[PDB]
Structures are given as structure tokens and as C-alpha cells.
Amino acid sequence: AMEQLLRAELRTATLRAFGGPGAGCISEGRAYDTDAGPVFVKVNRRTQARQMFEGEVASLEALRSTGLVRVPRPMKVIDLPGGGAAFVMEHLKMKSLSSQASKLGEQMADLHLYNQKGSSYVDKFGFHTVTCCGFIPQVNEWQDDWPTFFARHRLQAQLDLIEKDYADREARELWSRLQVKIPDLFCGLEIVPALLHGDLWSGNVAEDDVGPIIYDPASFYGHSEFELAIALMFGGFPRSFFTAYHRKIPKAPGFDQRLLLYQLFNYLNHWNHFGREYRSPSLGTMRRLLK
Amino acid sequence: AMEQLLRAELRTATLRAFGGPGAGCISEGRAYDTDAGPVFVKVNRRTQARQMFEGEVASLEALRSTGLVRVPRPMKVIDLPGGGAAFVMEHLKMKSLSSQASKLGEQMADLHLYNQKGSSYVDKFGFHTVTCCGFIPQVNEWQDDWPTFFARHRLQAQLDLIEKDYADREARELWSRLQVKIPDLFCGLEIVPALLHGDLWSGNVAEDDVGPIIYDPASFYGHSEFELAIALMFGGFPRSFFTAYHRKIPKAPGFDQRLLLYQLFNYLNHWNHFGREYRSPSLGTMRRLLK
């Protein structure tokens, strides 16, 4: 227990956490108090910044429309002199997801069931506009078949970037072998398009006194299970999140092998964003899928 | 700049950045009340956390020894089971820098001038111990020549990490050309070592009712001008901070070109920490310098 360590090292009986969040993370954006409440502002001086933020607006609006999960309200996208854009959204007073984890597991399962169960059914995988995964714009072209969508517009896209930027022989050869085996992980299963947050890392979820909050989405209609891959692989969610979720959407047969395929996407995306530290998990995951 | 644009776009009379330390991009941070008063604790689980925090301790101590600026007292660096470290320091109630901006400009100029004006004899560039740029340990080996120190132990070090992790051909080729240009940016000036805070982002300065406060240093003896590059590039300092500062330390010839070189360092550091988003301004800044 880190609080027990601090009490011992500081020789104190009380250790009462208090106070506001501070200036935050330089690379993420900055919060401001205003006349109407706090806001959070992201700035991107690149020419495709408006397209990025409009994708995030589209994602936040799609999630808000379900009424099932709490996300910050988008307020404005501003074009900047010199290039790029700023995106302003509502800022919530927030803490790490802990007490609200089981509630968020329920809400995330309801979100994934919303499309199938509702009144205006989206019957393809993809999305009506471009959304970015981190800095990389994605193709969301509608496709009837999920393994086709995911192989072509998620895995192949990442691997083409790796080939362009690293010319990596082992990724190229392992992908030529893996590509053909992907349908074995989906046969005999019904896969229904599910609206996804798209980037449900523990650093994109939090909570307040009312309930859990999720943010920084990169949404599309996908296989529900894909949502959970990044959540599992980087940790940070209480067990009760997954317990609540899978009470509503039990793990289908083949869940753990599909989990590898979905974690592969995230490793490839991290290799393209952060470099070669992520080559070893990417290749290793491909190797695990092949044997 | 950005704040005036936000005020207009949001039609708000007030706009006050969230200020003070806390959870950043790199470490967690939380205040606690204890039997002996409040403290602020930073936590990092990476193996190099102790080294990082010992560098911050040394930097805080060097700044406090001058008696010219207010900074938190460092209290303890604690090894964590399971790896990493916690760093406890004095807690100060703070808001973002506003009314005290011109006072901080005076203080920062007096800080930089202290090695020249005070009972201080440091006639090389560098520092007596390792300090970290975020996660990245720095070499602070003493050097008589500032453009040598900055090229070798700041720019080259960042670009060697970019080569290792991204193997980026354009970065390598542009750097080789820029290395040849660097001495010309110094206008034959005699650079005097100045004690720097080293990371004077607006998120690392604040104020209380006594005056301004600075924190999260990464200190070394450098060219005074380097201090201002991150302050300018990410904004957040009122104009009166720079007015007050340059009344005491006027811009030397070539300031505007060196500002690009010093901002380059910060873009490379963001490329290394935060990924590919910062490739474009890194390469673009080098190209601008080569024009």
C-alpha cells in the first residue's frame, strides 16, 4: 500500500488526500475556468487537425445520442491562424475509475448492445466519417463483414505504415502468413455491429460523484470484443468492470484468441506512434497467433 | 494568442488556466494532509524514477540556494515495492500565473544573472549531477563552449534516441546539415553560464498571495535564452512577464534564430516522449533553420 508507505516514511497517522488536478499534461491539452464552467482545450497546429477534431466531435455525439454513457459535451472547433485548430469541450471534475467501475461495465455492455437492440439499426461495420486513432486518420468505409473490415482498415493499414516507415521484413512475412488464418477465429459466430468508444484505455475513463465518465473516443461500429482489448492489455480497470460487463455480454467461444488479434492492432498502432519499443510485442503477438 | 481567442470564441469575461502541480504526462501527483501539514507527492513506477526525482531534488535545491524565486522544498525520495519511487515535497496553494507575471519576469532574469552578479563562480555549462528531461536522463558533463554543450548533450542526445526508436531518415539528414549551421547562430557572442529552471512551461509556474512560484525544474547552467523557448512555444505567460524579463536581459543579436534552435529541442523531446505527432514540427523547425 503506497499510502501506508507514505505514512511510515513521513511518520504520520493521517494522510488525507485533497485538492484539485493542477495544470495537467502538456501533450493532451489544458483546462480553463470560464464564466459558464470549466472547459478543456486541445490544440493541434497540423493541417489535418480540423478533420481529427471533427471525428472526435462525431464520436462524442454518437455516444451522447445513446444516453447510456457520460462523455464531455463538445463545444467548439476553432480554426487557428498559422494552421491547425483547437477543440473546446466541457471539462468534468474527475478522479480515477474505482468505485464506479462495475457501473461503467454495465454501461459499456449496454452501449455495445444499443445498435442491435434499438430502432435504427446500423448493419455494417465502419462509421459515417473519419476518426483518428491517436494521430493517425482511419478509413471507416462501411463493410458487411467484420473480419474484412478489421483486416483491411485496421491491421493492414497499420502494417502498411510500418512497411513504409520501417521496411520491417519480419512484420511483412508474419502478416502474409497470419492474414489467411484470421477467418478461423470468427467461424460459427454471429457478429453484430456494436457502437464502440474505440479507445477505452484506462487513461480515457474516470469518475465523479455522479458516475463514471469516458472521453477521447475514436468511435466506429465494430465487434464488441475489440473494445476490451486495450482495456485489458494496459491494465487499470478494476476486476468488477469486466465482471459487470460480461454478466451482460458473456465471453463468446474463441474470446481469448480474438483478444490476441485485437491486442495486435493496439501494439501495431503503438509501434507506429512510439517506435521500435513496440516491435517485439507486435511480432510476438503475430507469432502467438500462428502457433 | 490562444487565451484571447478562447475568450472571444466562448464569449467569456473570465478565462483562468488550471494551475499548479499534479498528475502530468509522466508522473502521478497528489496532495495529502498529514499530522505535520500538507505535502505533495509525485509517483513514478518506471525503473529510472529515483534518478529522475533525485535530479529534481538537486534542481530545487540549487534554485532555493539563490533566494531569488520561491520553489517547494524537497523532502524525501522513497523507493516503491514493485519498482519506481515516490517524491514528497512541500505543498503550496497555487493558482495559474496572472497578476504576478511581471514579478516572475524580474525574478527569472535575476536568477539567470545571479551567476554573473552574485558570489557564484560557475564558468562552464552543465551541472554537478544528472537531471532528467521528463523520462530521459541527460548528460550534464561540463563544457566550456555552450553551442558544443547544447549540440552534444541536448540536440544530439534527442536525435540519437529518435534514430534508435524511429530510424527516421529525414531527421538524420537534416540534423547533419544543421550541425554545421549551429555556430553561426551565435553571432560571435560570449555566452555566460546562467542557472536555469530548465522546464519553464506555463504549467510549471503559478502564484499565491505572496507572489509567483515555480516548480518541476530540470536545472543546469545554460544560455539564459534557452529558458524562454518552452515558455514562448506553449504560451500561457502574460506579455508583462517577457517585458519585465527583457528589461533586465535584452535580446542579444540572433535571438530570434536561436529561439528556433531552442524550440527544436522541445519538439524533439516531445517526439521522443509523445510520438509521431511531433515529427512534423521537429523536421519543419530544422528546415526553417536551414533556409
Author numbering:
A (entry chain A), B (entry chain B): 0 to 290
Q: What does the literature reporting this entry say, word for word?
A:
Glycation, a non-enzymatic post-translational modification occurring on proteins, can be actively reversed via site-specific phosphorylation of the fructose-lysine moiety by FN3K kinase, to impact the cellular function of the target protein.
We, therefore, designed an internal loop truncated HsFN3K (HsFN3K∆) guided by limited proteolysis experiments. HsFN3K∆ crystallized in space group P212121 with two molecules in the asymmetric unit (ASU). The whole HsFN3K∆ polypeptide could be unambiguously traced in the 1.67 Å resolution electron density map, revealing a globular bi-lobal structure with the N-lobe and C-lobe exhibiting a canonical protein-kinase-like (PKL)-fold. The two C-lobes in the ASU are placed in a head-to-head orientation with the N-lobe α1 helix from one protomer positioned onto the N-lobe β-sheet of the second, forming a domain-swapped dimer. The dimeric arrangement of the two HsFN3K protomers is supported by an intermolecular di-sulfide linkage between the side chain of a Cys24 residue from the ATP-binding P-loop of each protomer. The electrostatic surface of the Apo-HsFN3K structure exhibits an overall negatively charged pocket, decorated with polar residues, near the P-loop for ATP binding, and a sulfate ion is observed in one protomer occupying the space for the nucleotide β-phosphate in this structure. Adjacent to it, the substrate binding pocket is also negatively charged and is decorated with polar residues. Notably, in contrast to a fully extended conformation of the P-loop in AtFN3K, the P-loop in HsFN3K packs against the N-lobe β-sheet. Apo-HsFN3K has an overall PKL kinase fold, and although it was purified under reducing conditions as a primarily monomeric protein in solution, it forms a domain-swapped dimer supported by an intermolecular disulfide bond in the P-loop in the crystal structure.
